[PDB]
Amino acid sequence: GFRKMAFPSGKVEGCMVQVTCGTTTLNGLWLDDVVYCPRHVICTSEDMLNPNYEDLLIRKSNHNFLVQAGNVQLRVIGHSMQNCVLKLKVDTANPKTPKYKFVRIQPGQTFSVLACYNGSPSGVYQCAMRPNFTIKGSFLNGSCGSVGFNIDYDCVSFCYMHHMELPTGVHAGTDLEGNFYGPFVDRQTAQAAGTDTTITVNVLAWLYAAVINGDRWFLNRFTTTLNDFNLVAMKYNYEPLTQDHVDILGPLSAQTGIAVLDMCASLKELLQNGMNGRTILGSALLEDEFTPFDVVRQC
Amino acid sequence: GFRKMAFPSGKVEGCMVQVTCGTTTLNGLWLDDVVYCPRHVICTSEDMLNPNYEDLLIRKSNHNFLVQAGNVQLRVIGHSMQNCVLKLKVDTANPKTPKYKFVRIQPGQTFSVLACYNGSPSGVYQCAMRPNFTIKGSFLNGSCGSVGFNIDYDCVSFCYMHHMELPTGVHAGTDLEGNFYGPFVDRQTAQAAGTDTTITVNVLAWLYAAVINGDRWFLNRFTTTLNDFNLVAMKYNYEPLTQDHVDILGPLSAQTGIAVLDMCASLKELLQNGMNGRTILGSALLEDEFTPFDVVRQC
Ligand SMILES: *[C@@](O)(c1nc2ccccc2s1)[C@H](C[C@@H]1CCNC1=O)NC(=O)[C@@H]1[C@@H]2[C@H](CN1C(=O)[C@@H](NS(C)(=O)=O)C(C)C)C2(C)C
Ligand SMILES: *[C@@](O)(c1nc2ccccc2s1)[C@H](C[C@@H]1CCNC1=O)NC(=O)[C@@H]1[C@@H]2[C@H](CN1C(=O)[C@@H](NS(C)(=O)=O)C(C)C)C2(C)C
Numbered sequence: 001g002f003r004k005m006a007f008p009s010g011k012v013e014g015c016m017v018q019v020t021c022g023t024t025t026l027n028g029l030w031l032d033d034v035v036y037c038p039r040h041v042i043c044t045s046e047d048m049l050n051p052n053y054e055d056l057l058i059r060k061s062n063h064n065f066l067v068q069a070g071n072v073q074l075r076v077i078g079h080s081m082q083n084c085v086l087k088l089k090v091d092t093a094n095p096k097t098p099k100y101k102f103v104r105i106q107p108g109q110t111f112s113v114l115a116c117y118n119g120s121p122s123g124v125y126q127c128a129m130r131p132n133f134t135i136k137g138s139f140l141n142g143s144c145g146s147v148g149f150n151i152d153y154d155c156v157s158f159c160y161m162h163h164m165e166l167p168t169g170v171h172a173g174t175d176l177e178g179n180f181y182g183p184f185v186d187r188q189t190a191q192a193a194g195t196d197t198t199i200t201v202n203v204l205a206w207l208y209a210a211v212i213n214g215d216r217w218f219l220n221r222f223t224t225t226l227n228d229f230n231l232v233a234m235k236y237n238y239e240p241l242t243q244d245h246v247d248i249l250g251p252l253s254a255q256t257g258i259a260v261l262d263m264c265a266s267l268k269e270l271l272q273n274g275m276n277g278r279t280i281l282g283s284a285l286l287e288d289e290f291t292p293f294d295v296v297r298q299c
Numbered sequence: 300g301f302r303k304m305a306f307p308s309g310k311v312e313g314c315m316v317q318v319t320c321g322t323t324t325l326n327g328l329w330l331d332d333v334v335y336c337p338r339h340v341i342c343t344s345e346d347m348l349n350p351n352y353e354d355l356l357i358r359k360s361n362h363n364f365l366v367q368a369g370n371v372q373l374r375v376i377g378h379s380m381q382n383c384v385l386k387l388k389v390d391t392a393n394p395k396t397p398k399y400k401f402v403r404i405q406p407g408q409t410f411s412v413l414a415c416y417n418g419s420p421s422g423v424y425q426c427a428m429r430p431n432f433t434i435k436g437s438f439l440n441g442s443c444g445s446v447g448f449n450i451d452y453d454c455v456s457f458c459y460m461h462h463m464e465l466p467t468g469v470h471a472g473t474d475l476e477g478n479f480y481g482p483f484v485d486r487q488t489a490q491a492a493g494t495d496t497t498i499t500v501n502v503l504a505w506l507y508a509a510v511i512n513g514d515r516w517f518l519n520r521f522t523t524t525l526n527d528f529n530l531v532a533m534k535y536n537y538e539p540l541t542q543d544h545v546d547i548l549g550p551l552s553a554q555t556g557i558a559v560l561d562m563c564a565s566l567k568e569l570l571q572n573g574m575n576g577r578t579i580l581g582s583a584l585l586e587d588e589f590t591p592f593d594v595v596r597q598c
Binding site for chain 2: 004005006009114115124139285
């Protein structure tokens, strides 16, 4: 079968603490003896319109930070400020720190999000970094600080840290070095994201997964060139397919015996004529949240 | 926002072992000093057409069972056979055994599945127990023994253990006492499941979640009685709505200010006239995989 899956969240639960700065309470990541968290923990619900995080960080001393690993208080001994995130050095090192790394995913790359509230893991779901650098996730108040991650067998790659919910209903945050994903800033303002395109490669890899799972009615006897299809897709707000993406689709093209350009033709007529009531993999829409690697992983 | 989420799989990863009986290798659940697993581990790929599990279990001694918790071999000291599952008592008790219970979910109830292969957790996704006692999950060879679970803060409720992939593409298994969910038997035969209905209450709770999230175009100025709507839905292969389900929808009806019967009217015209191209919560289909409790949990 073919489901939307997330990496096992186990290893990340062991790094989930509750950070507080006065009234404000948001989640933090405890890796080794450092606790990474959004810098807007030093803010009040009235110091959000436009806060100078440099002057706000002046008055805040180590004792203004309450890190609580479950029911056990860690001691903030030092505090740094990398980009939009705080970095509170603590006395104890995490005995549960797994083999980890800090990465920056690209538009189209998917990762699991362990949504936490008050330091407690609430649940896990999978999202892609939309080409407009936003995520269509599930966050409420107090979710800030929840992280996005992928796993390389032993190694947990961290790629996201939640910050805000944009006007259009979608979410935005940073990588683990504090740099925002996109043109966003950490302030309460009407800062809407641009127009969203569809990750073409991710839909082709989904149709490849669909063929592998038995749903193959959409398949036509046609072909098209990369120049031909790419120019057709561009009109429908689709991520321009490159020869790189074609190669990434390799193992799927091999498993299925269907050329990448043969698959682009079936998609081309699907864009021109619509799905007309029918369903692919039990979905009445063209799903782009699955990378070629996501599909291979489920085979 | 509104995503399909699974409970944090952490606590379950600590109970995931690799069980082997000759050539055959499938996953097992190590709770306290007992390892629960599907009884068809004692089978060969030629002893599946119709195997007498009583006579097959005769020749198999404790030393024919290789339980490997990661890289550490446990010692099978005793072996029982509750319904379709084996129960191998081991020397060491699991130091990571969480507060757990064994439950039997009902058609309509959803749970997280931690899909394991060779004792290793491969990933987690959420499914409901379809009214025809099958699950639309994601399983390959060696996935048998992967468990389905819900969490009550401290307490992990176990409700499923994978056994097979039915002809129609969907999966079927047992509860943790070995009893199959549905009319299925553990043998390799053409045993297709009946016609599937739609969990009406789960769609109403999804439209309630949709209203809470801003998508509310489907809402009409009409109403209907429980007798009226229920008889209309029955024609479209829908689970007959009971007054119990109406009460369960309570907190959602309260959050939204929309009566349960007002919501059934919008669904009634949606069934009669179709969605005509439009999308609710970014879905071009009526989604029934979310219980009222699933929706409350994300609020
Ligand atoms: C996050 O959990 C935080 N809450 C608080 C509360 C007080 C002080 C600091 C923080 S961080 C929260 C999560 C989002 C709430 C709605 N769903 C979420 O994902 N983040 C916010 O509320 C951020 C936060 C301030 C304002 N805010 C917003 O997202 C606002 N939208 S916006 C992008 O500014 O248009 C708000 C929801 C209208 C900052 C940006 C620091
Ligand atoms: C499960 O992992 C097992 N594999 C083996 C191999 C040897 C011995 C025992 C087992 S249990 C496996 C998982 C399914 C494979 C396809 N995707 C899955 O979810 N289960 C099976 O292969 C079961 C197993 C024997 C036959 N089988 C089937 O599902 C067959 N379909 S059926 C329901 O019999 O129509 C097969 C896929 C055609 C039993 C039932 C013991």
